[PDB]
């Protein structure tokens, strides 16, 4: 579980 | 036995089984805005179920007032009433909180409950 960056987080 | 107040194992059940019929009781460890752009701000949460923490929680925009009026803040204890899981292209999973009720304010809880460890996704 490498933490998800904000850049790819509202990716949906 | 403060950890008894939290749905220990809920995070693993969400991430491993895809279970979304549960209404788990979780503690907010941290909230921060995430870089958005010109649109409503989005809020990311580090949540704990007493056993694990998980940083991949996102708040639905319709719940933004709870953070901006400070009823949903670090240390508070809340029960999730509706949430969805979205899996990114790279395989990591996002838990979007749609409905939740703050059961106990951050001021009333006061501290991080137990010693949860980061979930291994």
Author numbering:
A (entry chain B): 1 to 12
B (entry chain A): 0 to 120
Quoted passage from the original study:
PrimPol is a member of the archaeo-eukaryotic primase (AEP) superfamily, whose members fulfil a range of roles in DNA replication, repair and damage tolerance, and it possesses both primase and TLS polymerase activities. Evidence is accumulating that suggests the primary role of PrimPol in vivo is to reprime DNA replication downstream of DNA damage lesions and secondary structures. In this study, we present an in-depth interrogation of the interaction between PrimPol and RPA, identifying that PrimPol possesses two RPA-binding motifs (RBMs, RBM-A and RBM-B) in its C-terminal domain (CTD). Comparison of the RBM-A and RBM-B structures reveals that the peptides adopt almost identical helical conformations that occupy the basic cleft in a similar fashion.
